[PDB]
Homo-oligomer: 91 residues x 10
């Protein structure tokens, strides 16, 4: 799953890889859950996909907080733009 | 791109799709850049990959903030875990 | 995301399609989370990966129960083997 | 098919990997068989695809029972929802 | 799933397509099961994978027989080489 | 290529793997040639694609015969259904 | 299978597409076969893979001649280098 | 890459692998270039893609000549069909 | 990430690999951003996608300059065609 | 080949898509060709792979120049860093 050999990567780089790829899979799942919620024709199934959808968002937030704590630039940029107002392209 | 036909998906659901898949590509690039930074043997190349790495994080934070503003659950869970202390699971 | 056109697939068949692909993605996440839990070197991250792992199983269990209720054969074969004793094969 | 090197994965973990991916491929086959049963224009082929479809369901139930016996959380969450008559999201 | 538009493909050609991809998925499962039977360290699981392996072969034989009946050259070449003594390259 | 390391797979299992993936590629080629035969608008090309199509069937039959000779269950199931009459789900 | 809509692709361009991708599948099969011929441990299987290998070469040659006849530049460049002597890097 | 381990493949065979995949990638590019030439709406871009298209054909011819020189059955079949008149299937 | 073993690739060859694949993902990202800018229905998101798009171009320009400095042929061909007028295909 | 429907994509955007994917496939080929030159054991084949490699760079330069002419900020950023001296991050 890593493009470079494990012998040359820093231990922190591999851990962030494990954390980043997790966020990717969680973000991807939220998108697919949400699409199937709109297209679903069974309300009982829609409730399940909607419930798991929101649980993926929670998992994404957790891993993102971990990235924020173990990466200086994630902390800088996340603090710059998240929980703000006005244009997002200037903060 | 979307698993379900666009004619049955909401307009805001497709916008979030565009935002989510973007963050995925942003996170993926951060992971790959960081790995190549560790394995690179050319100092001038390492500087470029490290610079673009941090700009990918910035782009991810921007697109992530947009999701927070256009989805209540994203706002709920991101507020719960981001910028906190103590165990990330105990919250 | 379907091999046959939706203009010819029954309504129930597409709903099961949405549920099955969800179980696959949830089962897939359980496998990958567990692998990272063993390989992770950061306890803080391992705690997150282990928590999200177990909630994905819950999502799989929920979506799988729906399949049991909307397909006579899923109900027959699941009831045959789930929560049995002795060899899984013959019994 | 694993993502982390086997040298760091516990033996008990690799076996669960073998079972999970099997369930995925079996669940996937059910989805594709069922679609091709609806779209097929030859009754003889329809009989075969429908027969093998149900045989994949049987295989999934078997492998899924093995997971129930060799993973605590699978048994906990499967017990909560499988073979229940009330609403799923409230169990 | 198909490469050419469905409007120019004969209805029979599409039925054979549905049969062929099924055989491919069946053959694929037989190989993967067998590889996992050798590597599995849990007998309970090895027994399950071995059972489903042989059940996939049966599904492959059925779907292949349908191809033999709906294609002149499948019947010609299969009857030439299946169930023969001596070198296969000579019959 | 394979899924488990070749140092735990028995010699015979890997040989069958080589045969199975070969058969899959022949079946894959037959399905694609036939589709291009129906959609092609150039007679000289259709003749070539149709000729190579039938040569793939012959290659598949040869490899299948080898599987029959080197696997007891392939021989059992192929003998049951190949070259039969009546509903295929009855033999 | 095509990248641009068929509405704008000339009839002849789509036919060459069918011919080119066929050669690719032919070339791929030759390579796959040759590799398995070296690694196979069963002479009977090796004989089959070697036989089908050379027939894949023939199919590639046939489809390639068709390309030469239906494209002036294929004819120009193929004639320059095929059946020549001396260092190939020399028009 | 390769399907069998490099340590069991003959140097002879790996070189042809490198040559075959190159022809594959060049053939693929010729098809993609030709499609974009038909769909392009900018004459300047169409001229460039058409120019590179013909240069990919030349690269394929060179690599093919190398295959013809380092494989007897390539030399036999390429001579049978290339630069011939009359039906291709009867040559 | 590479096709040939790393122990046979020259050092400068692996660095250029890291640089080339980086440009690929950036070029890919520029295209995807632009497509979403056209399809987006939310002006706030469109501003973000447009902002990151142009910053991806800057990252590509940086990496390309590095390739120009670490490869004599990139420098030769880039100097021939970049920042020119008249028919590109001429020079 | 596109992710969004062609009816919402502007004409000029689809053309840049066609040009970008070409540069992508050409850059990929340069990398793959180069790896096979280092690992090849046949001098004749190496000469061919090395020859096509450098012409693939030429194809990339041509297509890349077209992007520079049909996209303002490609021209701006390429003008900033290409044919420069000293650190690139500056
Ligand atoms: Ca996933
Ligand atoms: Ca989930
Ligand atoms: Ca939770
Ligand atoms: Ca999750
Ligand atoms: Ca920035
Ligand atoms: Ca970016
Ligand atoms: Ca939960
Ligand atoms: Ca499968
Ligand atoms: Ca089956
Ligand atoms: Ca059974
Ligand atoms: Ca099965
Ligand atoms: Ca009850
Ligand atoms: Ca049965
Ligand atoms: Ca193939
Ligand atoms: Ca023959
Ligand atoms: Ca073949
Ligand atoms: Ca050998
Ligand atoms: Ca032949
Ligand atoms: Ca063939
Ligand atoms: Ca390519
Ligand atoms: Ca090329
Ligand atoms: Ca030339
Ligand atoms: Ca990407
Ligand atoms: Ca970047
Ligand atoms: Ca910048
Ligand atoms: Ca090119
Ligand atoms: Ca030239």
């Amino acid at each position: 799953s890593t493009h470079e050999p494990l012998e040359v990567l820093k231990e922190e780089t591999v851990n962030r890889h494990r954390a980043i790829v997790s966020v990717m899979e969680e973000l991807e799942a939220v998108d697919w859950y949400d699409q199937r919620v709109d297209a679903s024709t069974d309300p009982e199934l829609t409730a399940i996909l909607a419930h798991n959808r929101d649980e993926e968002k929670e998992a994404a937030a957790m891993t993102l907080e971990w990235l924020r704590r173990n990466d200086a630039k994630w902390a800088e940029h996340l603090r710059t733009y998240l929980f703000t107002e006005g244009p997002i392209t200037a903060a």
